[PDB]
């Protein structure tokens, strides 16, 4: 947010020729309206505004969403499954760096996240959070200027994939 | 090494070097463009490579639709200046007269009129500060090519006399390889700056 910084491709919004999708479902059933609500809202937001199978790509997390988008004949370009009940960082880290590096090749041009927000034990609200480009950003009510040791550009090139991976792991 | 002029109006030796460089450029052009072949080989691929090189330079400076016309002026200009710089190096003969057959670009009048011909063409296809910048870039282009050939000509000549009068092969060898390097770099910067002012006045 300081001294420009909008020169990086992850801050400024490039023109949209494709749209990525990071859908977070479960590996196992017996949750009632978890996967149904997430996959329903993803299917509605895809079939609402694209109307072409080449304009989007879907990254699922979970066997239920993977079976959903293979029954509905949609591309599942990144497709890891079989996560633990309390997942660590490395197993989502490798698919998260593949997602960020597949954005950095110029493929996605934007992407979104879809997951159930845990508020308190009974609601599980469905959220659409825009992952990147990082246009929606806010300072912490007071700021201190920084000294950039290589440069600002190399620090952005290292930092912004890590911030995207941290957003993915928090979601 | 005086200016040998048979006629009072114009230098005779410069006209001889202009005629010999025009004939050698024309015969290498017709030797590279003998027949039509869809699979390029021999020298036709070399002429097409120079042709697409000039085209690439035009594409760097201007839109391809505007600068497509200039391609056949540019390729004969780069090849003409190329051979005109490399003629001064092999022979550079001295006769019992003043001087004969050094090179055309070493003459200042030749290079300055070629530069003002270039700028007359880019005025033809196309407020005191702008016109003094125009005369500035004309004379700095002409003086650029004239100086960067004429200093090497004098040095090579000096080396030749130092060798003949009394062991000194490799200094003039290194200088002469550097001088054909200077010749091709000066030809390329001359045609590139030509196309830069052409692109600046067309679009």
């Amino acid at each position: 947010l300081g001294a420009g910084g909008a020169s990086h491709p992850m801050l400024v919004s490039r023109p949209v020729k494709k749209t990525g999708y990071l859908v977070i479902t479960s590996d196992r059933g017996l949750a009632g309206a978890y996967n149904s609500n997430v996959l329903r809202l993803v299917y509605q937001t895809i079939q609402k505004r694209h109307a072409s199978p080449d304009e989007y790509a879907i990254i699922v997390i979970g066997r239920v969403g993977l079976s959903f988008f293979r029954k509905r004949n949609m591309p599942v370009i990144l497709d890891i499954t079989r996560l633990p009940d309390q997942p660590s960082f490395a197993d989502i880290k490798e698919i998260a760096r593949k997602t960020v590096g597949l954005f950095a090749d110029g493929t996605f041009d934007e992407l979104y996240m879809y997951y159930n927000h845990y508020v308190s034990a009974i609601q599980q609200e469905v959220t659409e959070r825009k992952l990147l480009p990082l246009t929606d950003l806010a300072e912490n009510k007071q700021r201190t200027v920084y000294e950039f040791e290589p440069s600002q550009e190399e620090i952005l090139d290292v930092l912004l994939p890590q911030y995207a991976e941290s957003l993915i792991y928090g979601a | 090494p005086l200016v040998e002029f048979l006629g009072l109006t114009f230098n005779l030796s410069d006209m001889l070097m202009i005629t010999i460089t025009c004939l050698i450029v024309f015969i290498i052009a017709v030797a590279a463009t003998r027949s039509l072949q869809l699979r390029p080989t021999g020298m036709q691929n070399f002429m097409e490579w120079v042709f697409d090189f000039v085209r690439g330079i035009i594409n760097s400076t201007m839109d391809w639709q505007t600068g497509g016309r200039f391609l056949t002026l540019g390729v004969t200009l780069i090849m003409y200046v190329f051979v005109a710089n490399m003629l001064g190096l092999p022979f550079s003969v001295h006769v019992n007269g003043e001087l004969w057959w050094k090179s055309p670009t070493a003459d200042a009048t030749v290079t300055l009129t070629l530069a003002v011909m270039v700028v007359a063409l880019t005025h033809y296809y196309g407020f005191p500060l702008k016109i003094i910048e125009e005369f500035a870039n004309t004379l700095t282009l002409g003086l650029r090519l004239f100086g960067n050939i004429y200093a090497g000509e004098i040095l090579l000549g000096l080396l030749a006399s130092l060798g003949t009068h009394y062991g000194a092969a490799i200094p003039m060898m290194v200088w002469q390889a550097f001088s054909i390097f200077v010749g091709t770099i000066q030809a390329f910067i001359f045609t590139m700056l030509t196309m830069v002012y052409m692109a600046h006045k067309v679009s």
Partner: protein
Amino acid sequence: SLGVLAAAIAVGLGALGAGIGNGLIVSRTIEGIARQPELRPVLQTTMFIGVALVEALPIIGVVFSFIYLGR
């Protein structure tokens, strides 16, 4: 007698100033097209107008050098 040396310091200081100015301009446009190589024409045109300035004042210096030579 001293007009030769006058023309000589004039062309020498003009050459030194034009060399340093052109060196600075083309140096920083090398690093400009190295940081962002898709900005080559917008760097190149401003490079050439800077070259035009930093030569055009030593060019009128070296034009004046010949009338220094004659006197």
